[PDB]
């Protein structure tokens, strides 16, 4: 009763059905989601002299905790049914597609205006140019952007959490064999994801298609990190890249 609701006026909030959806999310965010109400306290600052071509100091940092980061986010996608509902195949290249959608947004959402930082597997706490120049170049201002304009958003785990769902059941990934069963979730979860903004009912004007078009931006930001990994397998060697990382973010 979709349309109609709307047209009226009504703002729906998530049904029993939705809701249950939103705690299994929520939970599995939360589950791989390093700490919470105490991220600050635990969060250690990269020495300033670190990360002033790639500063292989700052890379190499940043190469040590890239592997359990990127292992949250298979976590994560490994507390969702309707993943596991899928083939081998494409859960794999689900993966890859949102790997570093999901990281950034997880770095973005940490971000704090004091310090000027982003918090990195939820203790490495580093600057813009620190991250700038550890190898993510522009990237890191892209995620630096994010996070400073998402600060006004006051997301919750439950928003990051449906966030996260969103990028992984991208059906437009390449060679994904499930495309309609993948697109089937997503716009299960755009929809569960909207009624629990109804029901939040943030003080800002047109919340919802805002929120649509950090989407985007994460999308962008992801390719963009395919186009630093190629500049970086220039600028450093194999040998300096964790083999789980290889394994994610090279076809
Ligand atoms: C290391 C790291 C971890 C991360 O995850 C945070 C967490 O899952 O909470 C989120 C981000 C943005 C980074 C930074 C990063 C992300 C990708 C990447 O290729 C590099 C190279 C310089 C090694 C660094």
């Known amino acids: 009763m979709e349309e109609l609701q709307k047209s009226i006026g009504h703002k729906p909030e998530p049904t029993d059905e939705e809701w249950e959806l939103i705690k299994t999310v929520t939970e ?3 589950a791989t989601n390093a700490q919470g109400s105490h991220w600050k306290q635990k969060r250690k600052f990269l020495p300033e002299d670190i990360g002033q071509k790639v500063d292989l100091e700052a890379f190499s940092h940043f190469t040590k905790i890239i592997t359990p980061a990127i292992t949250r986010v298979v976590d994560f996608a490994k507390k969702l049914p309707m993943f596991c509902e899928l083939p081998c195949e494409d859960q794999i290249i689900l993966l890859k597609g949102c790997c570093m959608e999901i990281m950034s947004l997880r770095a ?5 205006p004091e310090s000027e930082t982003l918090t990195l597997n939820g203790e490495m706490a580093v600057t813009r140019g620190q991250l700038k120049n550890g190898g993510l170049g522009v990237v890191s201002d892209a995620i630096f952007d994010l996070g400073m304009s998402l600060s006004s958003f006051n997301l919750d785990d439950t928003e990051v959490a449906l966030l996260q769902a969103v990028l992984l ?3 437009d990934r390449p060679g994904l064999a499930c495309v309609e069963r993948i697109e089937k979730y997503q716009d299960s979860f755009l929809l569960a994801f909207e009624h629990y903004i109804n029901y939040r009912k943030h003080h ?3 919340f919802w298609p805002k929120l649509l078009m950090k989407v985007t931006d994460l999308r962008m930001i ?3 990190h395919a186009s630093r990994f190629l500049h970086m397998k220039v600028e450093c060697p194999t040998e300096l890249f964790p083999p789980l990382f290889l394994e994610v973010f090279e076809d």
């Open 28 to 30: 599995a965010h939360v």
């Open 204 to 206: 800002v004007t047109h």
């Open 169 to 171: 059941m991208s059906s």
């Open 108 to 112: 973005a959402v940490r971000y704090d």
């Open 222 to 224: 992801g390719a963009c």
